[PDB]
Design an enzyme around this catalytic site. Structure first.
Site, mmCIF file in Angstrom:
data_model
loop_
_atom_site.group_PDB
_atom_site.id
_atom_site.type_symbol
_atom_site.label_atom_id
_atom_site.label_comp_id
_atom_site.label_asym_id
_atom_site.label_seq_id
_atom_site.Cartn_x
_atom_site.Cartn_y
_atom_site.Cartn_z
ATOM 1 N N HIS A 60 0.943 -0.879 -0.209
ATOM 2 C CA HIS A 60 -0.014 0.358 -0.425
ATOM 3 C C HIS A 60 1.130 1.198 -0.670
ATOM 4 O O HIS A 60 1.591 1.732 0.887
ATOM 5 C CB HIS A 60 -0.992 0.140 1.142
ATOM 6 C CG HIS A 60 -2.001 1.189 1.441
ATOM 7 N ND1 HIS A 60 -2.912 1.752 0.369
ATOM 8 C CD2 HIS A 60 -2.092 1.669 2.356
ATOM 9 C CE1 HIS A 60 -3.495 2.198 0.030
ATOM 10 N NE2 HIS A 60 -3.821 2.497 1.688
ATOM 11 N N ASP A 62 0.693 4.694 -0.109
ATOM 12 C CA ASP A 62 0.201 6.811 -0.572
ATOM 13 C C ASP A 62 0.930 7.732 -1.084
ATOM 14 O O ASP A 62 1.513 8.019 -1.194
ATOM 15 C CB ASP A 62 -0.014 6.703 1.260
ATOM 16 C CG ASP A 62 -0.599 5.668 1.805
ATOM 17 O OD1 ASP A 62 -1.999 4.969 1.483
ATOM 18 O OD2 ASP A 62 -0.699 4.994 2.981
ATOM 19 N N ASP A 174 -8.147 1.144 2.108
ATOM 20 C CA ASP A 174 -8.295 2.161 2.564
ATOM 21 C C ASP A 174 -9.149 3.263 3.094
ATOM 22 O O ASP A 174 -9.115 4.138 3.262
ATOM 23 C CB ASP A 174 -6.417 2.520 2.518
ATOM 24 C CG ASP A 174 -6.149 2.888 3.544
ATOM 25 O OD1 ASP A 174 -6.275 1.879 5.223
ATOM 26 O OD2 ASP A 174 -5.072 4.070 3.856
ATOM 27 N N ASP A 311 1.571 -1.353 4.657
ATOM 28 C CA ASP A 311 1.768 0.457 3.762
ATOM 29 C C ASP A 311 3.712 -0.201 3.209
ATOM 30 O O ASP A 311 4.537 -0.429 4.316
ATOM 31 C CB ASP A 311 1.817 1.322 4.407
ATOM 32 C CG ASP A 311 0.011 1.654 5.183
ATOM 33 O OD1 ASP A 311 -0.840 1.164 4.873
ATOM 34 O OD2 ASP A 311 0.251 2.137 5.889
ATOM 35 N N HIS A 441 -6.432 9.646 -1.030
ATOM 36 C CA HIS A 441 -7.792 9.175 0.553
ATOM 37 C C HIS A 441 -6.559 9.671 1.835
ATOM 38 O O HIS A 441 -6.969 10.012 3.131
ATOM 39 C CB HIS A 441 -7.745 8.143 0.705
ATOM 40 C CG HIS A 441 -6.681 7.285 0.401
ATOM 41 N ND1 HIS A 441 -6.256 5.973 -0.460
ATOM 42 C CD2 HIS A 441 -5.661 6.062 1.942
ATOM 43 C CE1 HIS A 441 -5.656 5.332 -0.294
ATOM 44 N NE2 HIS A 441 -5.334 5.265 0.967
HETATM 45 C C1 LIG Z 1 -5.205 5.201 7.983
HETATM 46 N N1 LIG Z 1 -4.664 5.102 6.978
HETATM 47 C C2 LIG Z 1 -3.334 6.173 6.311
HETATM 48 O O1 LIG Z 1 -3.841 7.737 6.148
HETATM 49 C C3 LIG Z 1 -2.859 6.902 4.732
HETATM 50 O O2 LIG Z 1 -3.612 7.172 3.970
HETATM 51 C C4 LIG Z 1 -2.735 4.940 5.111
HETATM 52 O O3 LIG Z 1 -2.444 3.867 3.993
HETATM 53 C C5 LIG Z 1 -3.865 4.078 6.584
HETATM 54 C C6 LIG Z 1 -2.976 3.681 7.518
HETATM 55 N N2 LIG Z 1 -1.881 2.363 7.239
HETATM 56 C C7 LIG Z 1 -1.776 1.545 8.386
HETATM 57 C C8 LIG Z 1 -1.044 0.610 8.369
HETATM 58 O O4 LIG Z 1 -1.906 -0.402 7.553
HETATM 59 C C9 LIG Z 1 -0.976 2.579 9.668
HETATM 60 C C10 LIG Z 1 -1.411 3.246 11.204
HETATM 61 C C11 LIG Z 1 -0.795 3.329 11.609
HETATM 62 C C12 LIG Z 1 0.860 3.807 10.992
HETATM 63 C C13 LIG Z 1 0.623 3.896 9.899
HETATM 64 C C14 LIG Z 1 -0.193 2.807 8.763
HETATM 65 ZN ZN LIG Z 2 -3.121 4.624 2.724
#
Ligand SMILES: CN1C(=O)[C@H](O)[C@H](O)[C@H]1CN[C@@H](CO)c1ccccc1
Ligand SMILES: [Zn+2]
Ligand SMILES: *[C@@H]1O[C@H](CO)[C@@H](O)[C@H](O)[C@H]1NC(C)=O
Length: 1015
Positions: A60, A62, A174, A311, A441
């Protein structure tokens, strides 16, 4: 055409109905915290009926969040893609899916030819598969459907050209909640399957219990089911590896082989992954197969999807190895042990779907039908993700402005073929990509770090400038005698004038038209109308004298009104917020009449005294203790008075009454009618002092909102023949009601300043007997019925308001249309409310790692439409949709796609023409040309122009409004040689059209056509 009003679709799962019935209890379900202890019959699977398991590696990525797009590309994504190339090449059974084409394109164009060819080969052979193929994986709450289509088309056009592939399966793991606008666009873009993840934990439990996690998702009005798209909802709390192998994350985490220590990762459940060996493989396989078989119980076929990723995963060479080698050892053991009756392998998303549908065709499953949406998402307890419907509202509004400038620029420049030197294709590509990137997003959602928000804003500002350059070159070409036309492609023949962005009090950026006897007697201005029908609309310009008159290019006088230029200032001396009037510039307002998809030219001319066809507004300043307000040459002195109730009426339109604080109290539609109570109020929500805190994502209010203390605010009344307004300086908001003879326009200049832990809400209070029902739109495309549920907390009853909301009873409707997506609700019968901004000190523990303390002034715009609806043909009480009236739809169009205004830069425009497009068909009011895009460069022998046509559905209320012309987009440009219906991305021809005529589309349908020209 299907009737989208009178036939209630029969579906297995209808989400509003499901919501009414569910209890939403949040009980501890054991290892599957939000579910139950899954049991299976070990004998379900045998030699003749095996479980086929597809493990689908993914990463994933971003396009901006904690770092900017480019920072992530440099630090992570370029290495992920580089090592994917190497590892997939070297391991032919390994597989990988890729979603975010913005990153893939950035990477591919930096590759040497040798590596581009290796990359094409691993795609051709099926090892690397693109899923969805959009520029990004967009938000589904705040995004307009036009921009979802834009970013899908940007990514898929790039894939077709460079990788020769077009994905037919979508991957949306996501976005924070999910919208049926997605299957609507995807199904009309060739897709056959899609996957979603973030839906309310109670919905996951409920659908899992009934094996309804895979469903044919059709639109809420679709009785026949032709819009249906097969959809897979993932069952668990996360798309990460602990929540994708099965119900117990303590076990699944042992199969994330990146979590052993050297990578700085671990398992929160306290049992680490162990390397697979000949000595432990049997035991490890018995744990993992048990997880798989429990997951399989939630679905109807013997084909099982196991995503493997997280991610920015699959970066390090050592990480590729540690995941691949361990899983290969598990597959080899499991597949060779008949007692498991499993066949497991790495696979792609398309492979999974193909096998599911093979199982379906074999008669092994039938899937349920579903309509509705998946808002508002909660991932746990009362943590509803309604905060991001409002976070960073400045960029939310910027999104809608750029949405429109992209359409206008592509439209205006489509009429001609341009020399490469003009850099038209170049500028349009930059504009489309920066807007497309912001659909991410963490972009429009307002959930990125401060410096990343700045990056998106800078990128959009560059896109706005690109659009302006294209637009103004286009106008000069379209309106100059061809044998005189002599373009310098770097030159600014016109500047755009925009009255609402960034807005008065946000940026002093509008240019004044400077006229004078000793400098310049007159100035040409040009309006553009992107909509495919004739439009009249008041337009305004700043001018350097009040003595200006307007003519058309036949020198016919045009009635005009001049008002002062008013700005509001927070006076640190008197501690008041009050207006100051310009003594050097004035506003001139007149009605512009512009052809469908056309242009109209006007001339502004100075004289030494009041012109015959220009009137002047009066101005009344209401406050105790007034001081003088000089206005330069403005011919009417400002009047003063104590605060008092006021009433206004422009033209023959409604009569509005205001409180002594300058806020609407009633609307009277006609001379005879009641003064219908319609009260605007501003309130504030706070933050909890114990338990979970609101942040960028979550809305966790400390109770119902409390009224903002208004004090004795200063009220300004401007009254003119063409336009009147009431403006008031409230704490944090300069609130303006503008009247031009129809539905009022509301503008709020919102500056939450330093009020920490505060959300400012604008509420309307009426006596409409709406009960617990209200309507909100999805992506500017459709209106869905909402039912307020007292069994849910306040924040759960907040929904996205991407463009409009309404309440109604048997007789009366009030609709509020927006120029920006914000969150809102109807928390009691007769109420509408919509959040303006939110400033939050704390992080909400979703990974952003900051509050929201980067607020800046934003000008929110609205239209407010109060109407009688007792004579309208409405859907039955059981229908899950609602539909706008003609007036409310036009009001929305006024906000999202206004006339564009151009000021000629130079002193004289030689060869100027008066009009363009006078002969364009003026289409029926429910039809729009959402997109006009030339698809070929000038070297193509056969030119091609693409159109996206959207027809909405407007209530029948007994107002004929009749006799219009058929719009055939294929004959808008001459020498048409062919006309084809295509997918909405223009990438596939679906129908070769008789007589080269594009048919018009049905209500609520969207079609695409490409005309080809032999010129
Ligand atoms: C809520 N999120 C966002 O806003 C981003 O788009 C991200 O990929 C996603 C969070 N991903 C999770 C892991 O799967 C995460 C949670 C905490 C710190 C890092 C990553
Ligand atoms: Zn994301
Ligand atoms: C593009 O893909 C199609 C898929 O069937 C194939 O027939 C065609 O040859 C491809 N073009 C190439 C290899 O450039």
């Amino acid at each position: 055409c299907q009737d989208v009003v009178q036939d209630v679709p029969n579906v297995d799962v209808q989400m509003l109905e499901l919501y009414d019935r569910m209890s939403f209890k949040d009980i501890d379900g054991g290892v599957w915290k939000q579910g139950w202890n899954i049991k299976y019959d070990p004998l379900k699977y045998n030699a003749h009926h095996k479980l086929k398991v597809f493990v689908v590696p993914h990463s994933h990525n971003d396009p901006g969040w904690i770092q900017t797009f480019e920072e992530y590309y440099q630090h992570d994504t370029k290495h992920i893609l580089s090592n994917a190339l190497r590892h997939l090449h070297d391991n032919p059974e390994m597989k990988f899916i890729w979603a975010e084409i913005s990153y893939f394109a950035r990477f591919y164009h930096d590759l040497g030819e040798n590596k581009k060819l290796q990359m094409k080969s691993i795609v051709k052979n099926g090892q690397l598969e693109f899923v969805t193929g959009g520029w990004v994986m967009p938000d589904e709450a705040n995004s307009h459907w036009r921009n979802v289509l834009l970013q899908l088309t940007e990514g898929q056009t790039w894939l077709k050209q460079f990788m020769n592939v077009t994905p037919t399966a979508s991957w949306a793991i996501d976005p924070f909640g999910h919208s049926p606008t997605m299957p609507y666009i995807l199904q009309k873009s060739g897709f056959k399957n899609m996957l979603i993840q973030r839906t309310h934990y109670s919905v996951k439990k409920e659908l899992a219990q009934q094996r309804q996690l895979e469903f044919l998702w059709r639109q809420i009005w679709d009785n026949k089911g032709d819009t249906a798209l097969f959809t897979h909802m993932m069952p668990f709390y996360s798309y990460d590896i602990p929540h994708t192998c099965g119900p117990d994350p303590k076990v699944c985490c042992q199969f994330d082989f990146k979590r052993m220590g050297s990578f700085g990762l671990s398992c929160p459940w306290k049992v680490p992954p162990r390397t697979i060996s000949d000595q432990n493989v049997a035991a490890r396989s018995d744990l993992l197969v048990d997880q798989w078989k429990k997951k399989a119980e939630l679905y109807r076929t013997n084909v099982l999807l196991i995503p493997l990723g997280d991610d920015f995963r699959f970066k390090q060479n050592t990480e590729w190895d540690v995941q691949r080698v361990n899983y290969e050892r598990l597959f080899e053991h499991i597949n060779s042990q008949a007692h498991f009756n499993v066949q497991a392998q790495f696979g792609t998303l398309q492979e999974y779907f193909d096998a599911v549908h093979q199982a379906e065709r074999a008669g092994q499953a039938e899937f349920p039908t579903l309509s509705g949406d998946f808002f508002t998402y909660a991932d746990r307890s009362d943590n509803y993700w309604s905060g991001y419907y409002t976070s960073r509202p400045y960029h939310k509004r910027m999104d809608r402005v750029l949405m429109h400038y992209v359409r206008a620029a592509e439209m205006l420049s489509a009429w001609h073929s341009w020399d490469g030197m003009a850099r038209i294709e170049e500028r349009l590509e930059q504009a489309r990509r920066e807007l497309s990137l912001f659909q991410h997003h963490d972009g429009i959602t307002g959930t990125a770090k401060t410096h990343v928000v700045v990056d998106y804003e800078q990128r959009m500002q560059e896109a706005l400038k690109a659009c302006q350059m294209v637009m103004q070159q286009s106008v000069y070409r379209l309106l100059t005698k061809p044998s005189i036309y002599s373009p310098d492609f770097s030159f600014s023949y016109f500047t755009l004038d925009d009255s609402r962005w960034p807005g008065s009090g946000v940026e002093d950026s509008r240019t004044t038209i400077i006229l004078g006897e000793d400098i310049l007697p007159s100035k040409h201005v040009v309006m553009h109308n992107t909509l495919p029908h004739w439009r009249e609309q008041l337009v305004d310009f700043y001018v350097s004298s009040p003595f200006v008159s307007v003519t058309d290019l036949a020198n016919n006088p045009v009635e005009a009104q001049v008002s002062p230029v008013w700005s509001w200032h927070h006076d640190t001396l008197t501690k008041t917020i009050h207006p100051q009037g310009s003594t050097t510039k004035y506003r001139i307002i007149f009605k512009a009449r512009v052809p469908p998809m056309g242009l109209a030219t006007y001339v502004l001319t100075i004289s030494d005294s009041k012109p015959e066809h220009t009137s002047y507004a009066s101005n009344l300043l209401l406050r105790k203790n007034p001081t003088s307000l000089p206005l330069g040459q403005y011919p009417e002195d400002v009047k003063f008075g104590d605060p008092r109730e006021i009433s206004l009426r422009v033209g023959n339109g409604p009569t509005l009454a205001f409180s002594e604080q300058g806020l609407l109290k009633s609307i009277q539609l006609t001379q005879d009618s009641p003064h219908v109570p319609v009260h605007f109020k501003f309130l504030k929500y706070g933050v909890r002092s114990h338990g979970d805190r609101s942040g960028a994502y979550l809305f966790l209010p400390n109770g119902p909102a409390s009224p903002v203390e208004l004090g004795q605010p200063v009220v300004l009344v401007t009254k003119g023949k063409l336009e009147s307004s009431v403006s008031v300086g409230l704490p944090s908001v300069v609130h303006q009601t503008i009247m031009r003879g129809g539905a009022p326009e509301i503008r709020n200049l919102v500056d939450i300043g330093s009020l920490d832990n505060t959300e400012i809400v604008m509420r309307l209070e009426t006596h409409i007997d709406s009960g617990d029902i209200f309507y909100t739109d999805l992506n500017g495309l459709q209106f869905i019925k909402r039912r307020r549920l007292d069994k849910l907390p306040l924040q759960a009853n907040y929904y996205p308001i991407p463009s409009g909301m309404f309440i109604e009873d048997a007789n009366t409707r009030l609709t509020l249309l927006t120029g920006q997506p914000l969150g809102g609700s109807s928390l009691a019968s007769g109420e509408l409310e919509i959040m303006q901004d939110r400033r939050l000190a704390s992080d909400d523990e979703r990974g952003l790692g900051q509050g929201v303390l980067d607020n800046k002034p934003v000008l929110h715009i609205y239209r407010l439409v109060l109407e009688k609806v007792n004579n309208c043909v409405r859907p039955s009480k059981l229908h899950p949709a609602g539909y706008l009236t003609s007036a409310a739809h036009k009001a929305s169009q006024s906000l999202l796609d206004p006339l564009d205004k151009f000021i000629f830069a130079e002193n004289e425009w030689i060869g100027a023409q008066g009009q363009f497009g006078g002969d364009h068909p003026s289409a029926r009011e429910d039809l729009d040309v959402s997109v006009m895009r030339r698809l070929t460069k000038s070297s193509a022998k056969t030119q091609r122009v693409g159109y996206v046509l959207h027809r909405t559905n407007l209530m029948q209320c007994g107002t004929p409004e009749e006799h219009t012309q058929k719009l055939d987009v294929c004959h808008l440009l001459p020498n048409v040689a062919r006309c084809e219906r295509t997918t909405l991305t223009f990438l596939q021809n679906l129908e070769h059209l008789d007589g080269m005529v594009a048919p018009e589309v049905c209500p609520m349908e969207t079609a695409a056509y490409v005309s080809s020209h032999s010129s």
